[PDB]
Amino acid sequence: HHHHMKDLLEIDGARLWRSLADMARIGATPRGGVRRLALTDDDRRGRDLFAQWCRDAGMTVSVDAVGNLFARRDGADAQAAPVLIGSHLDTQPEGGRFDGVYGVLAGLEVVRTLNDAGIVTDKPLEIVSWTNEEGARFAPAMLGSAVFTGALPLDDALARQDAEGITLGAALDACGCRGTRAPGGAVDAYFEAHIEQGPVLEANGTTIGIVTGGQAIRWLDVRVTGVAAHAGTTPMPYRKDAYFASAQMALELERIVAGHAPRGLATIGQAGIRNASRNTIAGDVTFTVDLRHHDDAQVDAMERALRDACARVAAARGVQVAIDTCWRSPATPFDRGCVELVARAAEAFGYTNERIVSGAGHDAILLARRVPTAMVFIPCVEDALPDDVTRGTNVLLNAVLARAGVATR
Template identity: 55%
Template sequence: MDMQTSPATALRIDGARLWKSLMDLARIGGTPKGGVCRIALTDLDRQGRDLFVQWAREAGCSIRIDAIGNIFARRAGADDSLAPVMTGSHIDTQPTGGKFDGNYGVMAGLEVVRTLNAAGVRTRAPIEVAVWTNEEGSRFVPVMMGSGVFAGAFTLEHALAQRDAQGVSVAEALAAIGYAGQAGAAPAVGAYFEAHIEQGPVLENHERVIGVVQAALGQRWYDVTVQGMEAHAGPTPMELRQDALLAASALVAEVNRIALDRLPHARGTVGSLEVHPNSRNVIPGRVKLSVDLRAPDDAQLLDMDAALRAACARIAAERGLAIGVEQVVYFPPQPFTPHLVEAVRANAADLGYSCMDVVSGAGHDAVYVARVAPAAMVFVPCADGISHNEIEDADPAHLEAGCNVLLRAMLASAGVVA
């Protein structure tokens, strides 16, 4: 049966049930300020994983765990040989995390399964809900570890060997919580959708309910060292100084300008400064700073890279000192699959939800999955654009709307059997 003429188009998720799932999960690692601290591969993470697995099995799903600890809950399709239509996100949090980042995408996937079960809808292709390991990267690096291994961005061996600040490896931590699964090639995915809070203020500022995510911004991160000469703050005349902090301050302004010159989607941030010798009456001789540049396509990102390097050369010459630039991270821009993006947009409109095209400024598991499968994302607003914070919040009606769009988009890809 064509999904467009199927009674399945009348399906709506149970918003109260979705909210309850989120609140029940949030109790595991809940903080006094109302947030969640559930760090990857800790015992609290195990408890969260166990609860998801319990709920998924109660919903009739089979469970598969891979060697990096990713969990896949599978609802069988009429033709189980077809590649699954997958959704999901992560349930690990920042140390001062909230209830919705990542958790919403997992609970929304579970709610899709529960809704299909309650309505007796059978999909042609299987449906899977993924819980990706260590998305946040607050205990182990690299970030987005589980989806990165799945997509081949880095090897399983590399990921398993990474250690936290106490020297515990990923392999040891997985074994300790009972989620060291079976190695093997990642299976094919027919389509992947990820529902997520926006983690920024755009949707709220534009009073839109659904963000139709076009792409994730590419990122280039740099370590920059400004080398001047420390000297006594009193005897050294202003015109004879090689003040590294003064030069670094000019560079901070340049990073801001580079992004402002490339609106609307370019981003430029200096998030860290280390001043040496950091003494009240010594002219700073060395400053190390981080630079984070983001853009929606590689051409613009490379243009920003060139502008940064030119600014460093000019400031160094003007100030009579040296500036070294080392790129330390590169995430290429990741466009999402046009027909899946259009499915999100069309279903949002069909359901009567206001929507707008957006880009993701943050990394998500969907960014890696999109390297190996058709993929799209559904954004909903979060209060004041705040995330990675215990006060992170979202409107239950918006979460319900995003999950309804997710349900419809997944059904369009999976097909419905009469």
């Protein structure tokens, strides 16, 4: 049967906050963060703590052949594919206490709440922590979910080596979490709760980010060539200054992105004058460009505008410019129907809410290309507030219940 959002079934927010505090002990760093690098001893301790909690909540727990960790709560429909709630327990070298872990433990609290309420779903529920989401110890990021969706072959993943030469397969064996089951399988829908990792919801007082998808991204390398002449002997009209040229190109980029507001973004994150000295005009300048938009055609349009603009600047200043695209990633829309469940849950509770794009990668990005996917963002300051943690999980709970259905209560 159908869930009623207007019943406003709520979680135990204090219980979820305590589980976050307890998990943040595992790998706690001197600065107050968390280090559980994928498949290290501290990652295993976090996986094991989570698995224990899941089994105490009546779930069965297993790992697949790349270490993806699944907890299962059967529904009344023995044949139905599960509604999957996921994120990741692994961290960066100096990770925050909410990145990744919030969405995994939100799933656990969803189950603990269903247990407390005596609710049996129609479709089964599963909670997943994906292996090596962070891409720090092993490449790539979102390794476990990429293997699950078929984007990364299993044998290629098992052979990835960390900086010490250890293979991921060897690390799975050391972890004790190499399952025998091939990764993959039918999924009805995938939901992921996560902190925003950006300032929008906190700045607006918005409790719920209704996540629409991920951006189209381009990474560019720019090199500007001039003449590296002496700073004192060369009068200004003789100069072919690659750094003043690069500076004007940066401001052209700022103007191009302003023309694509609000969805277009651009960032020059690396830049340098090569073979540089204080009293030598720059003859060789490199910088990188990160370009974003909601749409691939529009981010490509921004790129072509930048190439045109830089060509014009270079011709006016007598320098040369080369622009190479070294990485592309497509926009990744989420499923309209699953996104609508997130919105409806937020509206039923009266929580402030806004549509927002995911500005960074998540396992949800990989899942969305294969199965109906939505995300719940909460604001963050790294830190999140207890009532935002609670209310985001209330939204997750009720969107998942709407999707999975309620068989009995």
